[PDB]
């Protein structure tokens, strides 16, 4: 009928930075109605190895290099030197 994929989620305050190799801590929430509605537009995967060209291929979620996030939008572009 209306089967939805419920994913357990957690709000952390101490995080490993994505900018550079660091750690950061933010204040706890103040709002009691944090609400987001995003549109999955993609996926960033990775494949299991040691089974090259064989019958199965395992693919797991990935991410981490935020560059790979800009790359998905900028792929079709390029800067050429103009006179």
């Amino acid at each position: 009928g209306s089967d939805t994929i419920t994913l357990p989620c957690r709000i952390k305050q101490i995080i490993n930075m994505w900018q550079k190799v660091g750690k950061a801590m933010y204040a706890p929430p103040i709002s009691g109605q944090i609400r987001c509605s995003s549109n999955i537009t993609g996926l960033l995967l990775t494949r299991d190895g040691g089974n090259s060209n064989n019958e199965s291929e395992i693919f797991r979620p990935g991410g981490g290099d935020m560059r790979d996030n800009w790359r998905s939008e900028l792929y079709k572009y390029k800067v050429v030197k103009i006179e």
Binding site: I5, K12, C36
Partner: protein
Amino acid sequence: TSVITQACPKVSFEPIPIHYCAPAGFAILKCNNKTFNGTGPCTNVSTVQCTHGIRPVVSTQLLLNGSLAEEEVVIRSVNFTDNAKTIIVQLNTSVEINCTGAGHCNISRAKWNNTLKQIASKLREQFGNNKTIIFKQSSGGDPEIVTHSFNCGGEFFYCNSTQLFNSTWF
């Protein structure tokens, strides 16, 4: 080992579509090939003053609020052979993921299982004629890597996604 104590403030982070235009004596060349696939000699192409409305969303394993493929699901990687390299996937249709600070994110079961078989219709083998495609979840590593981490309403969410990547197809 630099520690910095700033007046940690409760602000609200909002994404402003960023347009990137031509930098100095350079020119931006947009490839118009509806299904341009990464590296290669783009046939249909043209100069532009600025790219397009790019929404800088920081998050893991799931690209959100961005550009979709206008034709079919297109994947891209530097080397589809080296298992160590990230494979980006551009989706055909958008999927929704509604989340709240109350600890959960729900996404339509049907909508997402469909995109999975679509992505499955072309994995590593390279749109391979056929073989078994398996979706498992993260092997391990940082919380931001092992879970769909993102900044929702200013707060940092770490959504457990074992349920999105745990299935088998052919």
